[PDB]
Scaffold this active site. Structure first.
Site, PDB file in Angstrom:
ATOM      1  N   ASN A  86      55.294  35.190 -55.304  1.00 15.80           N
ATOM      2  CA  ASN A  86      54.000  35.124 -55.995  1.00 15.80           C
ATOM      3  C   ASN A  86      53.239  33.869 -55.578  1.00 15.80           C
ATOM      4  OD1 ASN A  86      54.434  37.576 -57.269  1.00 15.80           O
ATOM      5  ND2 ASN A  86      54.863  36.704 -59.295  1.00 15.80           N
ATOM      6  N   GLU A 142      53.898  36.339 -50.374  1.00 15.65           N
ATOM      7  CA  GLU A 142      53.679  37.586 -51.115  1.00 15.65           C
ATOM      8  C   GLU A 142      52.197  37.797 -51.435  1.00 15.65           C
ATOM      9  OE1 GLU A 142      55.364  39.503 -55.301  1.00 15.65           O
ATOM     10  OE2 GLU A 142      56.765  39.153 -53.659  1.00 15.65           O
ATOM     11  N   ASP A 169      50.204  40.415 -54.012  1.00 15.60           N
ATOM     12  CA  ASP A 169      50.042  41.482 -55.006  1.00 15.60           C
ATOM     13  C   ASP A 169      48.575  41.913 -55.079  1.00 15.60           C
ATOM     14  OD1 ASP A 169      52.666  40.653 -55.438  1.00 15.60           O
ATOM     15  OD2 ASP A 169      52.519  40.766 -57.630  1.00 15.60           O
TER      16      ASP A 169
END
Ligand SMILES: Nc1nc2c(ncn2[C@@H]2O[C@H](COP(=O)(O)OP(=O)(O)O)[C@@H](O)[C@H]2O)c(=O)[nH]1
Ligand code: ALF
Ligand SMILES: [Ca+2]
Ligand SMILES: [Mg+2]
Lengths: 337, 769
Positions: B323, B352, B354
Site C-alpha cells: 500500500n 502496489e 489499488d
C-alpha cells in the site's frame, strides 16, 4: 497405439532417472594440485560442454593470466638481481609493472607490443628457468608463446585454452554429473591452508576420496609458506585424511597429476636432491614416477585398504576419459556389491 | 569505473546565482548556491546574514524542469514571470527534496539566473547525494564533516561563535572551555574565533585534548607496545595480519600486508616527521589509522553492485512495498503521489497500486485504500511519477502490483493507454524471444529486464486479507501487458509446482503465508526456487505496522512487502540490507535456497552438509559523540538469520553517564554457531536511557571483517549520522565443531602433525620391538 505406448516408454525413462542413486566424491589436495582443472574435464566429458558463449566468458581471464604471470616475472628480475639484456625493455618493464592486474578487459597496442618484447629478453628467459625460486603458475609458458593469437581483436579461446586458465578455487562447491546408470556428486574444495579449515563441512556421507597430488611439486615451495616443500605437504595431507574416522568404509583413489611436467622437470632438476632416499636412476621419467607412487602407498596405516592409483594429466581431455572409465568401474563395483 | 570518490566539479565549488522562494512565507531571495570541495554541505548566505547549510547526505532527490515543483500561489507565479513571455522559465527551475525519512520531507525550491545553469546543477548535485563511498566513508572523513560545519556556520562578523561548538558537543561545557584555551585560540573577548586560526589541524588537537581516549591505550599495550610510546613497522604489520584480517578469506586471493605497503600507511597517517623518519607510528597516528580509509568494518566488494545478475528472477530477494500510496495510518490517513517517488528512490522495486473506478461527471481512475476515509490521489499523476524516478536509484526491473477494482472496460481500457502513453518503451508489452512463456521455461534474469516495467494483473471484502480478496475480473485490454508475473489463486504446492509453469505466481497474506511456513517449509523453498511469491501484511495492522520479513526470506520468498510509512525494527532491517549490492534492491539468494538438486530444512538445529558455517564474536569497546546532552547510553547486538541462528538478546550496560567518550569493558557477545551465514545479518544499535533511539547499523555476517574497527552509526532510514560512532572488536571465523578441533588442526598444517606424532611412534619402538 503409438501415442499411448510413447508415454509408457517416457514413464520408464524417468523411472531409471529417479530410481538410480548418487555417490558423493571429494576432490581434495594441496594448493594447485589441479583439482578444478579435473572438474572442467568432467564437465567436458559427462556434463554440459563449452559453448562459444561460455568460451568468451574466460577471454577476460586469459588476459589477466598474462599480466599476473608477467608482473611476477619482472619482480623476480629485481629479487634475484638479474640484469636486462636490451635496455629499451626497461621502458616497457616500468609500463607493465604499473598496470593494475584486476581491471584488465582489453589487450591492445600499448601493452601487447611491450609484453611480446619482454618475453624475448634473455634475462627474462633466464628468469623463467629459475621459476622454482619464486611463485609462477605453470600455464605461463603455454600462453606467452602464442601472444599473437591472444592479441587478435576477435580472439575466442578454444576448450584447450580454458583448461589452462588459473582461477583459484575458494570454499566448497558441489558439481553433480550424470553417468547414465549413476549420478556422481563431486565436491571441489580449496587447496591452501585457509581453505582446509572449511573442508569439515562436507565430510558426511562420503563414498570416495579422489586425492590429488602434483608430481612436479617435488622441488617447489608452498605459496602459503615459502619455507616448506610442496610434495612433503601433499605426502602429509594425504596421511592425515587416510587416518580419519569419517572415511572408514570409503574407497581411496590417488591421482598423481601433472605427469607431463615431471618428464620436463626431471631432465634438469633431480629427484635425488629433494628426496634423498631414492635409489633409482637420475633424470628418470619412469622410476622417479614409481618412487613417488610407492612413497604415498606405503604411508598406509590400514593394512587392508587397497589404494587405487592412476598417474594423470589434467589438461588432456583424452587421458581423463581412459582414467575415469576405470575409476568409474573401480567405484561402482565396490559399492553395488 | 566502479565506485568513484564524489568529486565536485568547478561550477559547484564557486557556485552560480539562484533565487530561493517559499510559498507559506512568500519569500523571494537571491542566493549564491555553493557546495564545499569535499562534498559535505550545500550552503548559502541567508536573508538574516546567517549561513544556512544543508546536509548533502540528506538529499533524497533533485528535480529539474517540468518534473520540478511549480508554485501554486497566483501572486508568486507572476513575480517569477509565469504570466510572462518566455517558455524558458522551466529550464531554470530546480527543486531539492531533503529529509531524514520519506514521510517527513521539506522541499527547497530554487530558480536560476542563467540559461541552463539550473540543469547541470541538478544532476551533479544528485550524484553527490547518492554516492556510495560518500555514505559509507571512513571515521576520519566523518569528523572533517563536523569541522566543515563549524567553519561554515559563521556569524555577522564572519567568525565561528563559541556556543556553536558548546551546542554541537553539548555532552560537556566546563571541559570544552579548558580545551580551547589549551589550543591558544582566544575565545575570551567576544566569544568568537576567526576562521584563519581554526585550521583542520587546530580542530584535531582540540579533540585530542578534549576527548581523552583510554581504550586506545589498552589496545596499544596489547600489540607488544609495553615500551609504550610508539609502534615499530613490524609490530604494526603483524598486528594487521593477525587481528585486522578476515581468516575466512583465502591467502592467495587476499594476500597479507607486505612491509613495503605498511610503510605507506605510516607516511599517510603519522604527522610527526620525528617518527615518520624512523619508520615508527605514534599513538596520535594510530588513532587515525583505526579510523582511516583502509581499516573500515566492511570491504568495498560488499557495498558495490558486484553480485551476479544473470540468475533467474526468482533466485533473488526483492525490495518491495505494501500500500505504497498511503503515507500514514491504513485507515483515516491521507494518500500521496509523492510517496511513490520516494519509495522508488529508496531502492524499492515492487510497488502496489489499488486503482478504482472514476466518477460520473469526469472519468479518471484514482488510487486509494478500499473505502476507508483516505484521500484519493489520481492514477495519471502516480504513473507519471513512477515513470520519472523508477530508474534513478537502480537501473533494474520494477514491478507494478496492480490491485484492480476498475469495473468497466471503458475506464479499464483507459489505464491500458495511460501505461503505454506514459512509460512507452519501458513497459514490457510482449515476451522476450529468448525466454518464452512455456511450461518449464525459467524466468528471465534481472539483467534481461534492465530498465523495464512489468505489470501484475489477472489474465486468462475479507477480515484480514483486506481489499485484495475481492479483486475484479481483468478485461482483454489490461491482460495484454501481463506476461512474466501472472498472479493466480494458490491451491497447493504439489499442484502449482507439478504444473511446471514458472511465470505463474501467487500472493500470500501474512497469516496464510505463516501457516505454510510451519506446516510445509521445505515444500515452500522448492516452490520459490522455480516460481515467485509475494507476501503482504494482514489487515489487522491498521496503524501501518510491520511484520518481521526475515521470517519469509528464510524459505526463499522474493517480494516480502512492507509498509514504507513506518520505520520500525522490521523496516529498519529491510532498509539496511538492500543498501548492499549497490543499492539495487536485488540480493542474490544463498546457493542452496535457489538450487534444484540441493534441499535443506530452514529449521535445522545442526550444521548443514556443504554449507560453510561460521562463528562470530562481538565485543563492544567504546563510543564517541553519542548525544547532544549528558545522558547514559546502552548498546544492543542482535543477529537475524535462520531461526537456528537468530538471537536478539544481547545488550551492554547503561554507560557510566558520559555520552561524550564512554568505554565499556564487557564480555564478548558470542554467536558460536551460525549455520547459514550467507543469509544471516548482524545488527548493532545504540540507545539512550529509557529507550530513546540514537543510531543503528545493519551489517552482513558474510562480509564483516575481524579486528578493531569503528562502526559509523545511521538514523532509522539508514542515512549516515555525522558524529556518533562506536568502537567494536570482531572475530568472524570458520566453524569447527568442539569434537573435531584437533582433526581440523592437522589439516591446516600436516607437516607438523605427521612429524610430531610419527616421531612418537618411532621413539616408542625400542620399548616394544
Ligand atoms: N601441465 C599441466 N598443467 C596442469 C595440469 N593440471 C592442472 N594444471 C594447471 O595447474 C593450475 C592449477 O590447477 P587448479 O585446478 O586451478 O588447481 P587447484 O586450485 O588446486 O584446483 C592451472 O592453471 C592448470 O592449468 C596438468 O595435468 N598438466
Ligand atoms: F589451489 Al585451488 F582451488 F585448490 F586454487
Ligand atoms: Ca492493498
Ligand atoms: Mg581449484
Amino acid at each position: 497405439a503409438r501415442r499411448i505406448n510413447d508415454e509408457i516408454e517416457r514413464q520408464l525413462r524417468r523411472d531409471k532417472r529417479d530410481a538410480r542413486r548418487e555417490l558423493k566424491l571429494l576432490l581434495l589436495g594441496t594448493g594447485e594440485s589441479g583439482k578444478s582443472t579435473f572438474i572442467k574435464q568432467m564437465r567436458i566429458i559427462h556434463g554440459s560442454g563449452y559453448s562459444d558463449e561460455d568460451k568468451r566468458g574466460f577471454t577476460k581471464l586469459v588476459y589477466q593470466n598474462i599480466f599476473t604471470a608477467m608482473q611476477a616475472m619482472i619482480r623476480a628480475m629485481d629479487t634475484l638481481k638479474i640484469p636486462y639484456k636490451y635496455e629499451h625493455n626497461k621502458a616497457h618493464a616500468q609500463l607493465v609493472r604499473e598496470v593494475d592486474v584486476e581491471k584488465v578487459s582489453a589487450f591492445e597496442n600499448p601493452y601487447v607490443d611491450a609484453i611480446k618484447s619482454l618475453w624475448n629478453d634473455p634475462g627474462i628467459q633466464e628468469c623463467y628457468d629459475r621459476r622454482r625460486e619464486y611463485q609462477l603458475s605453470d600455464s605461463t609458458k603455454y600462453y606467452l608463446n602464442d601472444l599473437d593469437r591472444v592479441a587478435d581483436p576477435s580472439y575466442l579461446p578454444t576448450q584447450q585454452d580454458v583448461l589452462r586458465v588459473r582461477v583459484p578455487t575458494t570454499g566448497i562447491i558441489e558439481y553433480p554429473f550424470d553417468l547414465q546408470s549413476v549420478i556422481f556428486r563431486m565436491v571441489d574444495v580449496g587447496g591452501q591452508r585457509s581453505e582446509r579449515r572449511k573442508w569439515i563441512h562436507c565430510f558426511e556421507n562420503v563414498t570416495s576420496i579422489m586425492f590429488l597430488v602434483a608430481l612436479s611439486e617435488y622441488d617447489q615451495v608452498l605459496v602459503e609458506s615459502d619455507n616448506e616443500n610442496r610434495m612433503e605437504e601433499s605426502k602429509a595431507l594425504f596421511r592425515t585424511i587416510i587416518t580419519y574416522p569419517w572415511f572408514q568404509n570409503s574407497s581411496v583413489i590417488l591421482f598423481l597429476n601433472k605427469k607431463d611436467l615431471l618428464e620436463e622437470k626431471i631432465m634438469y632438476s633431480h629427484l635425488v636432491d629433494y628426496f634423498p632416499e631414492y635409489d633409482g636412476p637420475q633424470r628418470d621419467a619412469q622410476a622417479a614416477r614409481e618412487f613417488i607412487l610407492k612413497m604415498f602407498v606405503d604411508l598406509n596405516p590400514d593394512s587392508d585398504k587397497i589404494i587405487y592409483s592412476h598417474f594423470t594429466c589434467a589438461t588432456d581431455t583424452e587421458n581423463i576419459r581412459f582414467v575415469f572409465a576405470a575409476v568409474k568401474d573401480t567405484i561402482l563395483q565396490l559399492n553395488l556389491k | 569505473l566502479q565506485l568513484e570518490p564524489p568529486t565536485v566539479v568547478e561550477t559547484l565549488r564557486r557556485g552560480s546565482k539562484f533565487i530561493k522562494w517559499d510559498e507559506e512565507t512568500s519569500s523571494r531571495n537571491l542566493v549564491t548556491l555553493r557546495v564545499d570541495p569535499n562534498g559535505f554541505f550545500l550552503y548559502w548566505t541567508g536573508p538574516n546574514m546567517e549561513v544556512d547549510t544543508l546536509d548533502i547526505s540528506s538529499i533524497r532527490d533533485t528535480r529539474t524542469g517540468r518534473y520540478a515543483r511549480l508554485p501554486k500561489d497566483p501572486k508568486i507565479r507572476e513575480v517569477l514571470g509565469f504570466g510572462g513571455p518566455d517558455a524558458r522559465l522551466e529550464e531554470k527551475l530546480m527543486t531539492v527534496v531533503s529529509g531524514p525519512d520519506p514521510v517527513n520531507t521539506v522541499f527547497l525550491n530554487f530558480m536560476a539566473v542563467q540559461d541552463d545553469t539550473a540543469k547541470v546543477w541538478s544532476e551533479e548535485l544528485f550524484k553527490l547525494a547518492m554516492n556510495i563511498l560518500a555514505q559509507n566513508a571512513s571515521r576520519n572523513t566523518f569528523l572533517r564533516k563536523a569541522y566543515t560545519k563549524l567553519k561554515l556556520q559563521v556569524n555577522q562578523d564572519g567568525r565561528i561563535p563559541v556556543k556553536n561548538i558548546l551546542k554541537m558537543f553539548s555532552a560537556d561545557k566546563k571541559r570544552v572551555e579548558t580545551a580551547l584555551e589549551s589550543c591558544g585560540l582566544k575565545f575570551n573577548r567576544s566569544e568568537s574565533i576567526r576562521p584563519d586560526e581554526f585550521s583542520l589541524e587546530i580542530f584535531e588537537r582540540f579533540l585530542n585534548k578534549l576527548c581523552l581516549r583510554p581504550d586506545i591505550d589498552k589496545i596499544l599495550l596489547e600489540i607488544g607496545a609495553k615500551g609504550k610510546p610508539y609502534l615499530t613497522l613490524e609490530q604494526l604489520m603483524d598486528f594487521i595480519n593477525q587481528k585486522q584480517r578476515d581468516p575466512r578469506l583465502n591467502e592467495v586471493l587476499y594476500p597479507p600486508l607486505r612491509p613495503s605497503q605498511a610503510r605507506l600507511l605510516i607516511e599517510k597517517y603519522e604527522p610527526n616527521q620525528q617518527f615518520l623518519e624512523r619508520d615508527q607510528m605514534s599513538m596520535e597516528g594510530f588513532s587515525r589509522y583505526l579510523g582511516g580509509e583502509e581499516n573500515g568494518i566492511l570491504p568495498l566488494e560488499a557495498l558495490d553492485l558486484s553480485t551476479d545478475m544473470t540468475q533467474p528472477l526468482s533466485a533473488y530477494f526483492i525490495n518491495s512495498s505494501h500500500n505504497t500510496y498511503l503515507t500514514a495510518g491504513q485507515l483515516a490517513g491521507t494518500s500521496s503521489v509523492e510517496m511513490y517517488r520516494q519509495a522508488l528512490l529508496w531502492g524499492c522495486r515492487c510497488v502496489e497500486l489499488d486503482v478504482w473506478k472514476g466518477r460520473p461527471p469526469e472519468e479518471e481512475p484514482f488510487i486509494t485504500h478500499g473505502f476507508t476515509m483516505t484521500t484519493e490521489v489520481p492514477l495519471r499523476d502516480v504513473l507519471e511519477a513512477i515513470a520519472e524516478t523508477a530508474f534513478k536509484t537502480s537501473p533494474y526491473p520494477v514491478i507494478l502490483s496492480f490491485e484492480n477494482h476498475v469495473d468497466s472496460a471503458k475506464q479499464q481500457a483507459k489505464m491500458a493507454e495511460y501505461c503505454r502513453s506514459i512509460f512507452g518503451d519501458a513497459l514490457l508489452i510482449e515476451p522476450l524471444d529468448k525466454y518464452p512463456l512455456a511450461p518449464g521455461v525459467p524466468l528471465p534474469s534481472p539483467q534481461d529486464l534492465m530498465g523495464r516495467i512489468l505489470v501484475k494483473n489477472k489474465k486468462r471484502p475479507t477480515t484480514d486479507e483486506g481489499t485484495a480478496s475481492s479483486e475484479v475480473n481483468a478485461t482483454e485490454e489490461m491482460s495484454t501487458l501481463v506476461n512474466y508475473i501472472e498472479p493466480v489463486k494458490f491451491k497447493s504446492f504439489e499442484a502449482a509446482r507439478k504444473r511446471n509453469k514458472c511465470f505463474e505466481m501467487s500472493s500470500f497474506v501474512e497469516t496464510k503465508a505463516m501457516e505454510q511456513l510451519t506446516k510445509s517449509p521445505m515444500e515452500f523453498v522448492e516452490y520459490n526456487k522455480q516460481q515467485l511469491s509475494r507476501i503482504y501484511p494482514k489487515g489487522t495492522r491498521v496503524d501501518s505496522s510491520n511484520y518481521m520479513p526475515q521470517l519469509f526470506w528464510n524459505v526463499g520468498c522474493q517480494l516480502v512487502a512492507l509498509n514504507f510509512q513506518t520505520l520500525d525494527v522490521a523496516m529498519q532491517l529491510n532498509a539496511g540490507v538492500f543498501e548492499y549490492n549497490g543499492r539495487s534492491g536485488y540480493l542474490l539468494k544463498p546457493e542452496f535456497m535457489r538450487r534444484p538438486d540441493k534441499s535443506f530444512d530452514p529449521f535445522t538445529e545442526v550444521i548443514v552438509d556443504g554449507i560453510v558455517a561460521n562463528a562470530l564474536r562481538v565485543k563492544v569497546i567504546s563510543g564517541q559523540f553519542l548525544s547532544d546532552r549528558k545522558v547514559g547510553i546502552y548498546v544492543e547486538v542482535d543477529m537475524f538469520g535462520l531461526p537456528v541462528d537468530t538471537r536478539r538478546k544481547y545488550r551492554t550496560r547503561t554507560s557510566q553517564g558520559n555520552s561524550f567518550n564512554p568505554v565499556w569493558d564487557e564480555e564478548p557477545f558470542d554467536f558460536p554457531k551460525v549455520v547459514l551465514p550467507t543469509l544471516a545479518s548482524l545488527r548493532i544499535a545504540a540507545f539512550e536511557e529509557g529507550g530513546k533511539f540514537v543510531g543503528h547499523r545493519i551489517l552482513p555476517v558474510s562480509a564483516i571483517r575481524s579486528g578493531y574497527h569503528y562502526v559509523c552509526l545511521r538514523n532509522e532510514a539508514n542515512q549516515p549520522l555525522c558524529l556518533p560512532a562506536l568502537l567494536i572488536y570482531t572475530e568472524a571465523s570458520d566453524y569447527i565443531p568442539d569434537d573435531h578441533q584437533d582433526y581440523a588442526e592437522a589439516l591446516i598444517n600436516p607437516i607438523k602433525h605427521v612429524s610430531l606424532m610419527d616421531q612418537r611412534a618411532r621413539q616408542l619402538a625400542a620399548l616394544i620391538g
